[PDB]
Design a protein around this ligand. Structure first.
Ligand SMILES: *[C@@H]1O[C@H](CO[C@H]2O[C@@H](C)[C@@H](O)[C@@H](O)[C@@H]2O)[C@@H](O[C@@H]2O[C@H](CO)[C@@H](O[C@@H]3O[C@H](CO[C@H]4O[C@H](CO)[C@@H](O)[C@H](O)[C@@H]4O[C@@H]4O[C@H](CO)[C@@H](O)[C@H](O)[C@H]4NC(C)=O)[C@@H](O)[C@H](O[C@H]4O[C@H](CO)[C@@H](O)[C@H](O)[C@@H]4O)[C@@H]3O)[C@H](O)[C@H]2NC(C)=O)[C@H](O)[C@H]1NC(C)=O
Lengths: 207, 13
């Protein structure tokens, strides 16, 4: 029969007060003969009724994709409230109940360190600027680079890695033309995480 | 107090 997948909000929508975080309940393998999908939403066991249904999408594999979205409050999600989506469909012998929430565990503040390029790299065309983000929990995070107030696109960030002390760490590598680094421009590692003061911190880096 | 990133209001204490 049809299957249900309940997704958390984007970490950026939960930590940035200008954005709106939403929990998404995706129902796949919806049949054409019984496309009706009843949605029951519960926040900490209490049913809520402010969820909207996304437009039905034909998947061109003989099934429908039916999606419900519930806006959540920022502090509600960050305070670890549980959101239950109950999906009902005539192709289901019994309703499917899924429940998600923020990763449990005490949030730990990330330590952000900028590491300059190695002296052995200055023989290449482009050098590597390193940002070490360690000791953070939960794993949800976002890392970006910028120079003189302008965003820097040419960078890659490793996924979070579980450390030996139960926290997470990652690395972000910004690649710049060696001339830029030797020019002396300041580069900034911008890290977003719930356990940071105001969910944000910057660490500069220059020669 | 408040933090700002690229001009977007992040958060305020
Ligand atoms: C009929 O067609 C349906 C849709 O098909 C079109 O699908 C795409 C993929 C094309 O390839 C093509 O086939 C068609 O044009 C089929 O539906 C799919 O079903 C499978 C399972 O049956 C679903 O897989 C699960 O996927 C979860 C993650 O899904 C996120 O990432 C997907 C890409 O990786 C993406 O397509 C999804 O939409 C979803 O995106 C996320 O959405 C949220 C909210 O909307 C958003 O905030 C996120 O940012 C966004 N993420 C991204 C990366 O964009 C997995 O978590 C899940 O895994 C767990 O459970 C599994 C089973 O228990 C287990 O095996 C795993 O190991 C893991 O534990 C699972 O893999 C798939 O998502 C779904 N596709 C869509 C688009 O919903 C349908 O199966 C098919 N029917 C038949 C009979 O063929």
């Amino acid at each position: 029969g049809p299957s249900v997948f309940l997704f958390p909000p984007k970490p950026k929508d939960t930590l940035m007060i200008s954005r709106t975080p939403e929990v998404t309940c995706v129902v796949v393998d919806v049949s054409h003969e019984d496309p009706e999908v009843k949605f029951n939403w519960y926040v900490d066991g209490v049913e809520v009724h402010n969820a909207k249904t996304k437009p039905r999408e034909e998947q061109y594999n003989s099934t429908y994709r039916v999606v419900s979205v519930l806006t959540v409050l920022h502090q509600d999600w960050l305070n670890g409230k549980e959101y239950k989506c109950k999906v009902s469909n005539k192709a289901l012998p019994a309703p499917i109940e899924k429940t998600i929430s923020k990763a449990k565990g005490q949030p730990r503040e990330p330590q952000v360190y900028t590491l300059p390029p190695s002296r052995e790299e200055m023989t290449k065309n482009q050098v590597s600027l390193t940002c070490l983000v360690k000791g953070f929990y939960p794993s949800d995070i976002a890392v970006e680079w910028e120079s003189n107030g302008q965003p820097e696109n040419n960078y890659k960030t490793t996924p979070p890695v579980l450390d030996s002390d139960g926290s997470f760490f990652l690395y972000s590598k910004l690649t710049v033309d060696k001339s830029r680094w030797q020019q002396g421009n300041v580069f900034s590692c911008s890290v977003m995480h719930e356990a940071l003061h105001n969910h944000y911190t910057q660490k500069s880096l220059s020669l | 107090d408040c933090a700002w990133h690229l001009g977007e209001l992040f958060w305020c204490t």
